[PDB]
Amino acid sequence: VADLKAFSKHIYNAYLKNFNMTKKKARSILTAPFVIHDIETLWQAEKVWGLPPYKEISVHVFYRCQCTTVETVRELTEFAKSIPSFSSLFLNDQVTLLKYGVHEAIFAMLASIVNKDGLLVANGSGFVTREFLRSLRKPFSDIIEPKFEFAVKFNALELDDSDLALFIAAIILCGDRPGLMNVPRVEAIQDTILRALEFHLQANHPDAQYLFPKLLQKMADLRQLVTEHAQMMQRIKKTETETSLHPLLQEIYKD
Ligand SMILES: O=C(O)CCCCCOc1ccccc1CN(C(=O)c1ccc(-c2ccco2)cc1)C1CCCC1
Ligand SMILES: CCCCCCCO[C@@H]1O[C@H](CO)[C@@H](O)[C@H](O)[C@H]1O
């Protein structure tokens, strides 16, 4: 309880140092950004704002998701490396962790910039509506909406940034990942983060009953969210041959 408090402080600093936007700053903005809600406003935003050559509205928007997804893998990688227990693993295990962990963490973190009406883009200087993203053609509308369903429920838990750092540290440092070399070591670290999380919630959310087991179920739900995301990504790679898929995301899905 004493030790695990110090542990959590370090993981929080890892978080504050590496992530380009806190949930704190996102809610404050979300409560002014340029609203993108149709083709004209997307154009004006671009003309708020170097991607692959143009194809069409839905694909262009998918290119922008893809670029932000890659940018977030970057942050998550620096954040992981800022955790001494992560950085102490052999480099191959770090890659295995990030490979199977980042999309779960990405979708967890995504909730911070989402409300029921849309999400922030371009570092908070823009806001893209959910109805606009719903209007894109299949399969680009289908891959977007489920993340929204997840976020609004997740945001009802009202985690702050110090909760999120442990929660995401817990997602990354997961002994379950296929092809781990040193499983007992990663399981041990995961257990520690989870114990630290449990205590942290006790102090930070003293009136929130069931919050810890609530968040453990969200980790199980994120796992299913990502399975469905990869399946949709398989369909896009198969039916949308003219859409470019970033090589880094390719190396992640190839598993
Ligand atoms: O999986 C992969 O690796 C392949 C990529 C598919 C990812 C599916 O993308 C989704 C789905 C749901 C919610 C958000 C996003 C994309 N994101 C955005 O922040 C974002 C960025 C730009 C726009 C935009 C600009 C102009 C008009 O719209 C809109 C949203 C999040 C997601 C996680 C990191 C970023
Ligand atoms: C930047 C952090 C995220 C990295 C995620 C990408 C991991 O890709 C994997 O890299 C391995 C070599 O390291 C290959 O042996 C695997 O075939 C490949 O799937």
Curated annotation (Swiss-Prot):
Record-annotated membrane-spanning stretches: none
Keyword DNA-binding: yes
Expression sites by tissue: Ubiquitous with maximal levels in placenta and skeletal muscle.
Principal subcellular localisation of the protein: nucleus
Keyword terms of this UniProt record: Activator, DNA-binding, Metal-binding, Nucleus, Receptor, Transcription, Transcription regulation, Ubl conjugation, Zinc, Zinc-finger
Domain NR LBD: 34-255
One of the GO biological process terms: intracellular receptor signaling pathway
Subcellular compartments: Nucleus
GO molecular function: DNA binding; DNA-binding transcription factor activity; DNA-binding transcription factor activity, RNA polymerase II-specific; DNA-binding transcription repressor activity, RNA polymerase II-specific; linoleic acid binding; lipid binding; NF-kappaB binding; nuclear receptor activity
Post-translational modification as stated in the protein's UniProt record: 'Lys-48'-linked polyubiquitinated; leading to proteasomal degradation. Deubiquitinated and stabilized by OTUD3.
Record-level GO cellular component terms: chromatin; nucleoplasm; nucleus
Keyword Transcription: yes
Function of the molecule: Ligand-activated transcription factor key mediator of energy metabolism in adipose tissues. Receptor that binds peroxisome proliferators such as hypolipidemic drugs and fatty acids. Has a preference for poly-unsaturated fatty acids, such as gamma-linoleic acid and eicosapentanoic acid. Once activated by a ligand, the receptor binds to promoter elements of target genes. Regulates the peroxisomal beta-oxidation pathway of fatty acids. Functions as transcription activator for the acyl-CoA oxidase gene. Decreases expression of NPC1L1 once activated by a ligand.
Family: Belongs to the nuclear hormone receptor family. NR1 subfamily.
Quaternary state and interactors: Heterodimer with the retinoid X receptor. Interacts (via domain NR LBD) with CRY1 and CRY2 in a ligand-dependent manner.
Protein's recorded name: Peroxisome proliferator-activated receptor delta
